[PDB]
């Protein structure tokens, strides 16, 4: 209930802010009382944790970062 009313008041606050700004940026052009605006905004309220972990591609040997190597080559004829 109280969280719901807090969400509704916060939504109405953001609507009032954007509505007042649209009324202020347009009224010097068309006149003081010749415009109305209404704002309906959907908000999110879900806590969203995230953890990316990128890696860099090292397929090509010209940008590989080796640590060891054990290259053996035999041959006969």
């Amino acid at each position: 209930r109280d969280l719901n009313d807090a969400q509704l008041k916060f939504a109405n606050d953001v609507e009032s802010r954007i509505q007042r700004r649209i009324e202020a940026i347009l009224s010097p052009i068309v006149g003081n009382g010749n415009v109305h605006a209404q704002v309906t905004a959907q908000l999110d309220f879900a806590n969203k944790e995230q953890t990316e972990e990128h890696y860099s591609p090292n397929g090509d040997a010209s940008k590989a970062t080796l640590r060891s190597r054990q290259l053996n080559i035999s041959e006969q004829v």
Binding site: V14, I18, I22, L43, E53, Y55, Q70, L71, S74
Partner: protein
């Protein structure tokens, strides 16, 4: 012939631990009405005036079509 190769690589990295915000905007929907201009009365605003008013309202919105924001501006006589 033969060719044995053992390798050990080393990897670059990045770790981002993002705790997102509670209370942000997902979508805006803005409906704008404007009156006709009465000079000496039945004069609608021209197409360039409606276009630049749409420009101003889009920029004052913080309009971002990634979020799918919608804006509609109409012109009509008042009452």
């Amino acid at each position: 012939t033969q060719r044995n190769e053992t390798s050990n690589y080393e990897v670059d990295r990045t770790i981002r631990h993002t705790k997102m915000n509670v209370g942000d905007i997902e979508r805006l929907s803005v409906a704008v009405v404007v009156n006709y201009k009465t000079l000496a009365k039945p004069l609608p605003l021209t197409a360039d005036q409606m276009k630049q008013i749409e420009d101003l309202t889009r920029e004052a919105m913080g309009f971002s079509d990634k979020r799918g924001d919608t804006l509609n501006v109409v012109n009509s006589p008042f009452s």
